[PDB]
Amino acid sequence: STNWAGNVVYRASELHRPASLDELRRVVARSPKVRVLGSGHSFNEITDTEGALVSLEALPPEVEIDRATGTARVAAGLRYGELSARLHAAGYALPNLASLPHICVAGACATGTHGSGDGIGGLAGSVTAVELVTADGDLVTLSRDADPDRFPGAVVSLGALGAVVTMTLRLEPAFQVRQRVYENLPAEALDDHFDEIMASGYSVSLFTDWRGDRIRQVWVKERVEPVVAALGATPADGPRHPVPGMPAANCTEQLGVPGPWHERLPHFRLGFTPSSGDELQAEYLLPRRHAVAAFHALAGIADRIAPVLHISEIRTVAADDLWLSPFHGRNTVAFHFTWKPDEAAVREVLSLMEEVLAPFEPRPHWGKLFAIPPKVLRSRYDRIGDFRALARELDPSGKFANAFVAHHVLDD
Amino acid sequence: STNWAGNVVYRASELHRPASLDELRRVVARSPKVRVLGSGHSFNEITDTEGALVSLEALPPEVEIDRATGTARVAAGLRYGELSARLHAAGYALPNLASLPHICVAGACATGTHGSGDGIGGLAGSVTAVELVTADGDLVTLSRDADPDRFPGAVVSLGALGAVVTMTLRLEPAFQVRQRVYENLPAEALDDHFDEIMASGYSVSLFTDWRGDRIRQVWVKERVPVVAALGATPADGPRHPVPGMPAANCTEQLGVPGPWHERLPHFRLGFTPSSGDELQAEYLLPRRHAVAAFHALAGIADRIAPVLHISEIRTVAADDLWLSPFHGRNTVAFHFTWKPDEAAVREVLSLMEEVLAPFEPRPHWGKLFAIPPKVLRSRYDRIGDFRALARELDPSGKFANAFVAHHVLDD
Amino acid sequence: NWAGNVVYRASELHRPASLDELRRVVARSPKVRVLGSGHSFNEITDTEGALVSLEALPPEVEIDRATGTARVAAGLRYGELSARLHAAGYALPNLASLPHICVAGACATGTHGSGDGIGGLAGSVTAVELVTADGDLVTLSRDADPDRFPGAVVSLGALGAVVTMTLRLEPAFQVRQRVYENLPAEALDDHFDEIMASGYSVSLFTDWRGDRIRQVWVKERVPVVAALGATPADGPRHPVPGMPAANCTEQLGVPGPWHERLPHFELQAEYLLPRRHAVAAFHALAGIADRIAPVLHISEIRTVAADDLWLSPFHGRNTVAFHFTWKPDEAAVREVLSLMEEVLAPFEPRPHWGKLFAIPPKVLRSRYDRIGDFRALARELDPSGKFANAFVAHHVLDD
Amino acid sequence: STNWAGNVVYRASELHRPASLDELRRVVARSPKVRVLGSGHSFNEITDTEGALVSLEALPPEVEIDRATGTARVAAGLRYGELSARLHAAGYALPNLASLPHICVAGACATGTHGSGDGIGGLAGSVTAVELVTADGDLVTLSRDADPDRFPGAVVSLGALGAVVTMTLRLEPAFQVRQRVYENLPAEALDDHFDEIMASGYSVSLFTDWRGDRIRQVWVKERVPVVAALPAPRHPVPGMPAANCTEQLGVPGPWHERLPHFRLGFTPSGDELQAEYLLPRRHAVAAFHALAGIADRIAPVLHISEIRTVAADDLWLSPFHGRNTVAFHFTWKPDEAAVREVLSLMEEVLAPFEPRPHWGKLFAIPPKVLRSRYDRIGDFRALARELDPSGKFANAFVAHHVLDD
Ligand SMILES: Cc1cc2nc3c(=O)[nH]c(=O)nc-3n(C[C@H](O)[C@H](O)[C@H](O)COP(=O)(O)OP(=O)(O)OC[C@H]3O[C@@H](n4cnc5c(N)ncnc54)[C@H](O)[C@@H]3O)c2cc1C
Ligand SMILES: Cc1cc2nc3c(=O)[nH]c(=O)nc-3n(C[C@H](O)[C@H](O)[C@H](O)COP(=O)(O)OP(=O)(O)OC[C@H]3O[C@@H](n4cnc5c(N)ncnc54)[C@H](O)[C@@H]3O)c2cc1C
Ligand SMILES: Cc1cc2nc3c(=O)[nH]c(=O)nc-3n(C[C@H](O)[C@H](O)[C@H](O)COP(=O)(O)OP(=O)(O)OC[C@H]3O[C@@H](n4cnc5c(N)ncnc54)[C@H](O)[C@@H]3O)c2cc1C
Ligand SMILES: Cc1cc2nc3c(=O)[nH]c(=O)nc-3n(C[C@H](O)[C@H](O)[C@H](O)COP(=O)(O)OP(=O)(O)OC[C@H]3O[C@@H](n4cnc5c(N)ncnc54)[C@H](O)[C@@H]3O)c2cc1C
Ligand SMILES: O=C(CO)[C@@H](O)[C@H](O)CO
Ligand SMILES: O=C(CO)[C@@H](O)[C@H](O)CO
Ligand SMILES: O=C(CO)[C@@H](O)[C@H](O)CO
Ligand SMILES: O=C(CO)[C@@H](O)[C@H](O)CO
């Protein structure tokens, strides 16, 4: 019926839940208009369609680990929670995960979903091949090794190349992670010490309510002195939640307690499992150089942000070569905004935000809200012409192109 | 707002999600009318209230394992999926789980939730102590060792004693379980071999559509073959109890050994339905009336199968818990996962109840039924005892909604 | 003390007439205890150093329309404070039995009325200003000091001398009050909850002679006990036999202003129990009614809502109040209380801090979850133990 | 989001763009607080509101000409760029145009926007009637002919009467205009020859950087040479490209591709602040010299200043109410803090010349004094209360400056 938040009521005629590869290939082939439905953790109409919603949650939850190549072959309908548990048990890990694990692996990689860390990509960077059902109904495989020229536009694809059934991931050895929350770092500390703070851990989040002159929280996640303590931030005495009033229970165990990578790198614990959300979201991704400038630009309109914000989160993400990846050929600073659920009021505040950041050539998070018109947005991605070439090659009728992918990427 | 099936719209004024014991104690105390809210996997008006709905999902998720006594202190908002995973990690298990893990431990035990298994009781049986917030707002502990007279009425409580915050669970060593599905057993094979079948593994499920003369599926889970010999054929790939639904949802089959918490339920940890498209009722009968009852239903299989997804038949050992459906009688379980027409199932239930009447059938407290109070109560010895415990720990009836008033507490 | 069973062993009795003067006295005196009205019955207000009244201070009463709160002199009595609050068209939720009781003295001990959804008077407090042992002002408020403010109000005057308390107000309201005579004692076994909920504030008066509740006072904001066999009173009544009805607030259902209705207007003990033990307790007490009734004027049963104030008797549990206005024979009463505390022990009872009791410390401290937090707040605000007498040392602070 | 400059961040709740009169009238009637948004070419908080910002650029762009009366009925949301090009096509013209065409007609007229020329008023004088949606949502027409007592209040209104949908303009025959730039006139030239200079063309503009005592540039626009006695494409600001500006070097062209300084195609956000003071024309030289005396404080934080002339009108809050006028315009550099210092000073040195500020550009002139400098303000306050008792269309700006006691 709706997206996780419940602001997007899907206008689809039918919701198909194929129980096999064969049953999917039939649904895709016979349907004139398809958009794959993963986890519903998007806030825009990217997943909307007047035709066929198709889930892949009901296919085999394959997770075949090849010990020789250190790579897992895994079902696109599978979520990061499950995938991680299974990978971890077998003694394998991924380099990073998003804020909660209950997010669909293909759905995440489609929109350029990311964690934080200076030397760590968006999650799609771990992908080394896809198999997808084309608009026709047959399996195509695109892999880095085999298809150098085409693979990089395959992964962060807005699910407009077809339905991905199995993604190959490069694995690392399973690892332990400790996480501490520091409170009330002074905002001015960023002006001279931004690079030192975000490098002070494997993955660092800044949380600010854009009220006053203080970074409300700083989450410093280390692979097994703290810099942000030196700079005025006090360690938190107990468990904490990024948002004011929301329970610490939900969140991954903090207070410096080492635990497995997959119960630490996300902000939310394997158990949390919210059936629904009461928030909106927008995230702008800038070149890393514009962090401070951009911080200040936003400091200038904090009086419009703070009223309708739950929390804003600031992260770093290494550059990839993935054509519609927000991290395409530029190390990045992430300006995320978990809003309160008033779309009208957030839409005003986003047009404004987009004006004050415009000098920093900001790319919006494909899954989160934005108002950046196509002309401007397309100019901010070099390889947008090469991706439109691949979408017409693999989907000439534009089966997998709803209004959103047309408007933002495909239409002239 | 609603139950997981969505047939029950809670008519509550407030939905509290306290983040601390203190915050809970304040909400309980100040609210003149409370019903706790766990996982929402009930289908009747048990969890409904005009007063204050109260989750405990927001309290610290304690799983404190005490190696010495081999027990686990666990938060009442926690669900079996999370609890199990954590218990398994530390190298511990429980004896049984329900069909899907993502059910709340306090809400499961509060209704008499159960698996299958000859020598295995309802899940509430692994409970040795409960700490709860009284209608007053203070903590009370009831344990088997400290309160032998009263503890047996406190676990399977319909949440009418107050809000349980922690539950002590006797553990076992973590164990491996293999699972095999068998297809199209002859219905007559039960008549002389029911007990031989249900005992053919640690936990055993019979799934029939109540169409014609076959048992669609038989699931035989073993701690690390009868029904083959009796004319059922091994399934060659993965399978789901209901026709149409995907095998993918379900725990790994084909006799492949796995961890207990990834086998004893039908549904794998990853399957996480946010909503359901079904109703439910389950009748629990003394084991001797298995065949007698099997036939008595077969006599109205023409009114069942129309509005039915699948019916599940299981065994449950006896316990001593006053409102447990397995209260001092080894049990045969007749489960019905209906299709979501409440008006139509209610009519089929009136009937089911009438034909099963001679077997003194106790309904599952969480699932649908229409068995009136007078009759329901007479099927429970220790109903007068529970009514006293409620009055002792909740004189004002704070935790007594119209459901618990009408079925157990009112005269 | 207003009873006269406690002779204050203080060297000096100061009555500062200015904040400045009070601040001086506190600073210069190495041992202080504040004196309200003297409506305690125990050794709580007693000290060998300096008694300090605050009755002479400016009776400030600053009603802030916006937040709907008042700022009032700790020395002010509820009678006086009420009259002023009422004239401005404001009220407090509840008042104790007589208004001529000091506001900071009341809140320090866990003073309370009756009412199912009504707290002790200390719950109406949002902030305190108090002179420390050093002579400077500290403000503790709920808003500004979440962690600490709950130890501060019901304090046993062991943190400093409170000068001004901020109260949350309601709109001023009328109240009617009817006394019913001779309810059957059995009527509580099934209808306790229904009776105590039959008004805004309800009181049960029993002489613990036979099986009758002598009187039941039912106070309503502008019904069960009539139907359960108690008869309406023909004319004005007083809770104690023989004492004149003239002393008591107007009854016979004549609507009146809250402050002329919620109060009713000897030694005293009160035990405060989880509300669920109301009937169980009421029997345990009937089971020694032969030792009570001889030395008793009247006993008063009331209900009080839970709060989060660390040494409130209502700390984290709705409450049934069992009060005993005794005949002034302390030696006799101390025998009765020792037995009473034994029969009531299973109901984990808390004593009214400002009334008599013999519950040993080790036990009394285990019936308060947040004693250690209150002990660390007194050592934070008064490390010298200026405001620590023998009472507060014995019961709460000493190790 | 912001005004064209970006110094004003709109603190509105809703930004509406009605696509019909019906839809506007609905937005107005249901909104308790409204301010219309034109082109955002203001620099103060005149357009600002905590209520409802309402563009009109999405209504029918009507341009209904009556050959008989030689008058056009035009959509308020229309810009001078568009409106001109369509007026011209039909073989009609307006007497004058502001510096660029991409300013909203009703936005222009609401603040008393103007060009240069001795015998031509501010743009608002060409308006003979308005239809506006009241705070109730119904249409009211005020016209000079029908409502003599009230109409003069209605045009230069500060958008405080209602939302103007259609304005009736008096038109002329379409005319050609040539313009020429002369460079470095001596400032002393003005001392005896100001009047002769500003009368030397249809419109004349004097650009000075307020460095020394020269006029950097004199733009002389003639319908189809005095400043020569006392020649150059060129941009009024140092460092900005000439290509942005209308075609000069005496090349004849249509009025609308000429009278503005900036060509139909430019279409730029901005990087400047603005103030303009409008003095009775006789104080030209006295004021020019009074400013030359603090030209040390000005020239630093200045792009360019423009001095122009404007005819008198009878429009109640027109800067040109009952007096021929000399315009001292300043395009400042974007440092509001620095400019607000210079304006307190400028407003003191010009005080004897009874200056009126441009309603659309910056000023620090206190209300009591500003109000004294308009005779008819008492009558505009009586009209606003007549058309908008609840003050739906009155923001902080209009209340502070004009309406509040
Ligand atoms: C609570 C929450 C936390 C979040 N945390 C983070 C975070 O920390 N970092 C971050 O970067 N983002 C984060 N996000 C954003 C989120 O990762 C994106 O919205 C994500 O891309 C949505 O994935 P989905 O599958 O849930 O959503 P959907 O709307 O269901 O799908 C997203 C897109 O993927 C496509 N897709 C899905 N499955 C397939 C498939 N098999 N083949 C092809 N295309 C497919 C769909 O067509 C659609 O276009 C968060 C979102 C939420 C709600
Ligand atoms: C998909 C599905 C699968 C199922 N599988 C099985 C199965 O295999 N076997 C079986 O026997 N049953 C099964 N059931 C039935 C189910 O276990 C019961 O309805 C059970 O009561 C679920 O409780 P809940 O907390 O999830 O729901 P709720 O309606 O929220 O809670 C049930 C009761 O528990 C009480 N409660 C919850 N938390 C507390 C607490 N902390 N303190 C006090 N009271 C509390 C509530 O007040 C309420 O009265 C299943 C149900 C579904 C929907
Ligand atoms: C006739 C009568 C009726 C009563 N009715 C009730 C009733 O209905 N309900 C009930 O609960 N109790 C009742 N009580 C008990 C009485 O209200 C309490 O004992 C109360 O706490 C005493 O207040 P006081 O002004 O007499 O203080 P005192 O006995 O003089 O002092 C008691 C405490 O107050 C402290 N104190 C006083 N002022 C300050 C200050 N400004 N700053 C710091 N500490 C201060 C002292 O330090 C001391 O610890 C009654 C008592 C009597 C005599
Ligand atoms: C680059 C530039 C050049 C300029 N050149 C000149 C110039 O040469 N001469 C000159 O005199 N001024 C000039 N100005 C100033 C400008 O002409 C005035 O500030 C003008 O009033 C603003 O027009 P706008 O449409 O941007 O108004 P806005 O800022 O959008 O709003 C201004 C006022 O118009 C009102 N309004 C707009 N439309 C309506 C309507 N339909 N009904 C009712 N009220 C309405 C608004 O409520 C507000 O009170 C210039 C400004 C800039 C930025
Ligand atoms: O990263 C995200 C969402 O993309 C979350 O951390 C939010 O910041 C809310 O906590
Ligand atoms: O039998 C049960 C227990 O309630 C179900 O979970 C089965 O899968 C039938 O749907
Ligand atoms: O309120 C009290 C004391 O708390 C009553 O006992 C009255 O004094 C009547 O005796
Ligand atoms: O905008 C105006 C008038 O308001 C012009 O003076 C420009 O500054 C020319 O550069």
Author numbering:
A (entry chain A): 5 to 228, 239 to 426
B (entry chain B): 5 to 228, 240 to 426
C (entry chain D): 7 to 228, 240 to 282, 293 to 426
D (entry chain C): 5 to 228, 240 to 245, 249 to 250, 253 to 288, 290 to 426
Question: Which statements did the authors publish about this structure?
Answer:
AldOAb was crystallized with xylulose, the product of xylitol oxidation. The overall structural assembly is composed by 14 α helices and 14 β sheets that are organized into two distinct domains, as observed in other members of the VAO family: an FAD-binding domain and a substrate-binding domain. The planar flavin cofactor sits at the domain interface with its 8α-methyl group covalently bound to the Nδ1 of His45. The residues that compose the active site wrap the isoalloxazine on its re side. They include Gln295, Glu327, Arg329, His350, and Lys382 belonging to the substrate binding domain, and Ser103, His118, and His45 being part of the FAD binding domain. A well-ordered molecule of D-xylulose, present in the reservoir solution of the crystallization condition, was clearly visible in the electron density. The ligand is buried in the catalytic pocket, and its OH groups are engaged in H-bonds with the surrounding side chains. His350 and Lys382 are located at the bottom of the substrate site where they interact with the C1-O1 group of the D-xylulose bound in front of the reactive N5 atom of the flavin. This geometry is perfectly suited for the hydride transfer from the substrate C1 carbon leading to aldehyde or carboxylic (e.g., glycerate from glycerol) products as observed in the AldO enzymes so-far characterized. When inspecting the molecular surface of AldOAb, a noticeable feature is the presence of a wide tunnel that connects the active site to the external surface. With a diameter of about 10 Å and a length of 14 Å, the tunnel is long and wide enough to bind polyols of different lengths and sizes.
